[PDB]
Write a protein that binds this DNA or RNA. Structure first.
Length: 302
RNA sequence: GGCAACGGUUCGAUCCCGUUGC
């Protein structure tokens, strides 16, 4: 009975995202597990973990929006754009309040971004950071990201704190390093927390220690860790919740499950959709409307 | 299932996802 679902963990600081994933994977004794977007060791926040069948639809989160809380240290520039690196430049913070508003505004809307060499973006088979750590630079191509909202939380001393909502693949890290140059002093990130991923309730987040407490509480009360861990998970189809659902009668789905496109009533004129079966409205996987208007299976649950 | 190339995701994912080849 492999476990399937989504766990909204709150990543501990100074831990790599893969490490958090493995510990969660082991804790739930799940055969398969993947995360839907990384968080740097320094950062903390929401890191969705897809378990079992859920890993199948992880691309949808991977591509959704994320909201962050970040504090930057003005006057200093690091080689990795964050506190976890060596300082390469240190200059006086001398920008006027109005110079700070103009800048914060240049990063609003649709913009192009050249990510840090210290990232997992792939170049010729290797991770960019691999070249970095070896003291090598490679040409990068500006990527198009979207800043939905930028919030000026404050500005005290050498600190500037903001909260931003952005599209997938956004390196707030780079905005700070970029902004640091616009202002004239330099700037690296010292605090980073992902508040949300897509329309996910921060109220469902749980910390690694909290999971470890439930496990402990389980042996103690002599009950299966599952009876406590399982309820913390979101449904496996949640990653595709952003799509229209469609139900098929047991009769129409037996064909669907054999890779056969089928016809139904309330079937969208195009795009992806979640497919469910008769009564319970049980989820059986992702479909897509083809040229003939039928609902063609694309990825199914075993 | 698997193996390989390449890409994705905010950096120490071989491990998760996708394209392609076998």
């Amino acid at each position: 009975m492999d476990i399937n679902g989504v766990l909204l963990l709150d990543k501990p600081q100074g831990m790599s995202s893969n490490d958090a994933l493995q510990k969660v994977k082991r804790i739930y004794n799940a055969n398969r597990a993947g995360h839907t977007g990384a968080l740097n060791p320094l950062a903390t926040g929401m890191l969705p973990i897809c378990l079992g069948e859920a890993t199948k639809f992880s691309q949808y989160l991977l591509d959704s929006d994320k909201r962050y809380r970040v504090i930057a240290r003005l006057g200093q520039r690091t080689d990795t754009s964050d506190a976890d690196g060596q300082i390469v430049e240190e200059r006086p913070v001398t920008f006027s309040a109005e110079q700070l508003a103009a800048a914060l505004d240049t990063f609003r809307g649709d913009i192009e971004q050249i990510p840090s060499m210290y990232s997992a973006l792939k170049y010729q088979g290797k991770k960019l950071y691999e070249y970095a750590r070896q003291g090598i630079e490679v040409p990068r191509e500006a990527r198009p990201i979207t800043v939905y909202e930028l919030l000026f939380i404050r500005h005290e001393g050498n600190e500037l704190e903001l909260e931003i909502h952005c599209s997938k693949g956004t390196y707030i890290r780079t905005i700070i390093d970029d902004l640091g140059e616009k202002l004239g002093c330099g700037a690296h990130v010292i605090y980073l927390r992902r508040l949300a991923v897509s329309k996910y309730p921060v109220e469902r987040m749980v910390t690694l220690e909290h999971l470890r407490e439930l496990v402990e509480q389980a042996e103690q009360q002599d009950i299966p860790a599952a009876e406590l861990l399982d309820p913390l998970l979101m449904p496996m189809d949640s990653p595709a919740s952003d799509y229209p659902v469609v139900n098929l009668p047991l009769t129409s789905s037996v064909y669907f499950k054999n890779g056969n496109p089928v016809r139904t009533s309330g079937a969208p004129l195009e795009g992806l959709v979640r497919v469910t079966e008769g009564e319970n409205g049980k989820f059986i996987g992702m479909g897509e409307i083809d040229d003939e208007g039928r609902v063609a299976p694309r990825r199914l649950v075993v």
